């Protein structure tokens, strides 16, 4: 099995690299991230090869001057072919409505729309950084997991900190109230703040509900944007 | 009804006031437009007071520094309470695969995510110059259809220039061939042009089938993206 | 001595870290790092965030910036007062001649020398590759001593070659450019056009651009005034 | 003498127009402003042509930087002999000069081997009457053409100018001010206010404005600190 392994925060950033690591452990990993969502189409793209972190396994990769779903269609050209497309693990939460604009989330997703598998992996944080040495025990098993289902699967994947369980999920979907602030530079003019807050907590059985009791979530996602029970 | 309409074209686009100017024949309109996809949460947001157009019916606006959905957020105070949320008309296409990283959608997705009824708004450009003047007959009739649902409701709407008829759609979702063409600037430096195609036409029934056929195009949208089928 | 480091790379850049290392063996290192203009954020706040220095790197109290270089050394001067010296780098990328103007890294630096600080930049020239920090340490902290010795305040812009093999203190390299600019299309028919001036002269003995295309270490001390002084009372036709 | 003009505020600026239509009194005029720094090399640029605001200029609106502006233009218009960038709305004065766009273009000029000049004007509370300023903008231009090329010089002018000054760079040392504070979601951030030590010396370009005076710097291209220039060992 060829797997590519991708991200949006960055070649540098460590969850990446923990992420392939933790794939190696399941075929030949590739690595593909921008060098700092759709596929550029507009000017060209440039890629550099990058080599692999000094206190990790080696990994032919390469630093992307593009967007993440730039890296997968970049990646699948230089590293062709590919089975398995993972994106992550990203530094931030990737839960509920946070789905819909996610970077890390649009990678796998592009490598879906590829005809391939894929999978995003995201660590909500609210605070701290994330151990991944900690971590690695759950990404496995994450991974292992995910390696079980139908070929092609598109999973969304949230672990928290300090993980104690898994378990599927579906997206939270809250209704939020509109909350704004008005205040001032201290120069004078005025500007606002925006805290928009749920109305109500996550349901059982959401991703968001599954991280608040500290397990790790994964969400089989849809690409169909569709409201069907709408449609005649 | 109070109507806020929006888009991420920008307060100076003739898209966004020919939505206005539509919207009005049903409600009280007002208007919040980015000044140039998420609510800003990080630091404050800046709006200014924005005039009405001399030749034109008078809304009150608000150029706002921040993303569509900000203008949704600060709308709802300055204006609120609101009972619509319409976005565009955008200058560009909005379909299939598009819907996802769509600036205009996402205002009209936030004003639903505060329990409003909303829609967004499009027309694909290929070489032309759209004619709103041509278009309003279309915008009112898909506002008439749109404000007879059960609410709340939440639709992408995609106009083609010169409209012959109106459609209820599902979004076009097509696998696609990765397309790599390589190259090299003039200074010998290489690069890659990327040129993904969809493996197959638009099924009828589509968004993008629909306009193709010079049909408005409008599909209802779900906030909830789980594919409960794997489950 | 207190030392704050900083970089407009990131706080994930090797870079950073590499250039803390080297500056703790001469005194206290702090890190502020942007997180991602040049001038500092008046407008609207800055948030920032503790940072735990990355596991392979000797621990440093560490800050992540929502925010420029320049609010990197603003907020640093606040958190971690008093500083002595402000490093800017190890910028991935050269900040030679004209590119000076433009320069995050080198923007950073200028803002400590714009507090009453001693300050420098450093850069690394890639073309299309990544410098071996490892390597690069000895001749980090050659530059390091060197620059400590000058007296203070100063304001320095560095470039190390990937492998270098000598120091050179250089003045900045000044080419005049020739237009270029060559149309063409996207796979889709639309025009678009590259640009590519062309500096009309190699760069020459002595300038910072010279010096690392020679494989040396070079230092370039920098002025904060852009007034050309022999054009104040001019004569006019 | 053909004139290209530019800016850093876009194609929609009323100052750009302005400076535009100032500089058709001493040449022909044709403009590329950006779309909304140095030049992009590492990928093409995007430039469509665009109407002048309801004097007719032949002008494009450049997907890219000031700088791209000025490259494209010569390309576009050439062959071009003086390249002036503005009216920027708002200052560029002292330590700005050095992270602005406006004189960006203006350097971009410069480095093409043509005579250059950057325009801003001062804000904040009253917006600037064109109408009023035209009289000293082409004053001002006037007398930059007697100087001896090619130049690069970076002029403000006061919303309401009375006289005219050479000057230099205001430099002028800061302390450090960072408020710290609290959004309504408990979460802390800063606020920075960085004032000057000292006030604007006589002669500089800050004070020149205050005084209500034009102000005209002429820049130099080399950042090198000669004072402090050593030999090898
Ligand atoms: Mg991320
Ligand atoms: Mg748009
Ligand atoms: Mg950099
Ligand atoms: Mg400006």
Redesign the interface.
């Known amino acids: 099995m060829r797997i590519l392994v991708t991200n949006d925060?960055?070649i540098?950033?460590?969850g990446l690299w923990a992420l392939a690591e933790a794939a190696s452990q399941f075929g030949e990993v590739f690595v593909a991230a921008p060098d700092?969502?759709?596929?550029?189409?507009?000017?060209?793209?440039?890629?550099?090869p990058?080599?692999s972190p000094?206190?990790a396994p080696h990994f032919p990769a390469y630093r992307v001057?593009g967007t993440p779903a730039?890296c997968v269609?970049?990646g699948?050209?230089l590293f062709g072919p590919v089975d398995l497309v993972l994106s992550g693990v990203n530094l931030g939460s990737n839960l509920g409505?946070?789905?819909?604009?996610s970077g890390t989330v649009?990678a796998a997703?592009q490598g879906y729309?590829?005809?391939l598998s894929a999978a995003a992996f995201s660590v909500p944080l609210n605070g701290?950084?994330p151990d991944f040495?900690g971590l690695r025990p759950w990404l496995l098993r994450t991974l292992e997991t995910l390696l079980r289902?139908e070929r092609p699967?598109?999973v969304n994947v949230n672990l928290p900190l300090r993980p104690k369980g898994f378990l599927?999920?579906?997206?939270s979907?809250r209704?939020?109230?509109?909350?704004?602030?008005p205040?001032e530079?201290?120069?004078g003019?005025?500007?606002?703040?925006?805290?928009?807050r749920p109305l109500k907590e996550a349901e059982e059985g959401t991703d968001r509900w599954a991280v608040a009791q500290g397990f790790v979530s994964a969400?089989?996602?849809?690409?169909?944007?569709?409201?069907?029970?709408?449609?005649?």
């Open positions: 925060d960055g540098y950033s460590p700092t969502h759709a596929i550029t189409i507009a000017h060209p793209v440039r890629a550099y990058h080599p000094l206190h001057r730039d269609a970049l699948l050209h409505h946070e789905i819909w604009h649009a997703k729309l590829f005809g701290e950084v040495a289902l699967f598109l599927w999920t579906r997206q979907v209704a939020y109230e509109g909350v704004v602030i205040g530079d201290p120069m003019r005025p500007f606002y703040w925006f805290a928009p969400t089989p996602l849809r690409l169909d944007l569709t409201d069907e029970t709408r449609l005649q």
